[PDB]
Amino acid sequence: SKNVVIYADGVYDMLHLGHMKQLEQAKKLFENTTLIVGVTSDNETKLFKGQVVQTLEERTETLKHIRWVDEIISPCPWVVTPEFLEKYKIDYVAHDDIYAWLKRAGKFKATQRTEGVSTTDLIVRILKNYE
């Protein structure tokens, strides 16, 4: 009944069914949720992850089409802080420890992955037809 605010951040480069299923899990952690998604900036992703295929605008615009996504913070901070959680009134952080302080506060929620549905998975499936 009481609306719970859930926050899930990530790069969301080349969104595939694995991401979508993870967004669905996060959205359905509780009966009544607001799922906020954070999309990392191009510069920080390149710098910390190393690379990024799609721009922030492309990655955000794709997520805007996903049913479970209620709100998008784009770009989002690379590091979640308690101040950030306070400002957006976030109840839980969904992710698949740097995250130890979130568990200690009961704010951490795990979401699981699905394999075999990515862009790479589909290119392999196509090229197996020819090589």
Added chain:
Amino acid sequence: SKNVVIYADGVYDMLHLGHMKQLEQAKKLFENTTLIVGVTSDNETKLFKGQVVQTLEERTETLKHIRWVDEIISPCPWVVTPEFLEKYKIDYVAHDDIYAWLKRAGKFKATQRTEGVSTTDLIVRILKNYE
């Protein structure tokens, strides 16, 4: 105010932002809509289109994550017929003539494409980094 039933069929192989934007247009043709999406069977697609990368289950499961999609008919008929439109109480068929009878009945609604956002577009973008 009055709810309008919109129907958009297709293969929806390798769903990308172009498809999603087209589903959004179809969903927002009127203030109050139900967007029904038809997903073609593997056999008919292979036979008439020629090929298909993702199975019906994969293509349907992906569309299930798309916000604009209210209902899915999977598989859908390869050919829309008036009987089909009657059975599901469809008011309009959204598409991007075989379709002449739909225009004559005022049931035809065009939706436009977006280019440069496909899987192929993104592989090219990656490989341009290496070749």
